Write a protein that binds this ligand. Sequence first.
Ligand SMILES: Nc1ncnc2c1ncn2[C@@H]1O[C@H](COP(=O)(O)OP(=O)(O)OP(=O)(O)O)[C@@H](O)[C@H]1O
Ligand SMILES: [Mg+2]
Length: 109
Amino acid sequence: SGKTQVCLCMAANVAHGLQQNVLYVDSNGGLTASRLLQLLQAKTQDEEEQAEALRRIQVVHAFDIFQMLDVLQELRGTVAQQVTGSSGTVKVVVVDSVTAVVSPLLGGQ
DNA sequence: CCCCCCCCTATCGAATCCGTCTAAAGTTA
Ligand SMILES: Nc1ncnc2c1ncn2[C@@H]1O[C@H](COP(=O)(O)OP(=O)(O)OP(=O)(O)O)[C@@H](O)[C@H]1O
Ligand SMILES: [Mg+2]
């Protein structure tokens, strides 16, 4: 319906319209960089601006609950350790799909 | 006590008439 498209457009806006770091957790494989490039072109036309906006987007793959927990705990630890600094922090993190990695566990007794 | 789905079938039933054309052959004082 709309979930991945809305997430991608919001991430593109936050990465370009505010100049902040954003992490994306893609689990179902629903993230193509061509869509992000199209959205950025729809926003602005400078190539270096698009490259800099893309450099603030980090994508990680986690196809089960354990990998997702590992990457989230790694982010927690690194941010809690890096509280002294004031640059490169992540303000928005998007999980592409939580049902993908949770549904296999459920079902039964 | 907990959380998610399935599938097509089978033929029926007849109606309605129209429009005319072509003449030929003399006979017996
Ligand atoms: N130019 C375009 N590029 C990409 N998607 C487009 C475009 N124009 C329209 N769309 C729509 O974007 C939708 C993408 O769906 P999306 O992946 O965001 O939904 P979803 O609910 O998160 O899906 P899923 O359950 O498969 O993860 C398509 O249904 C398509 O109709
Ligand atoms: Mg999707």
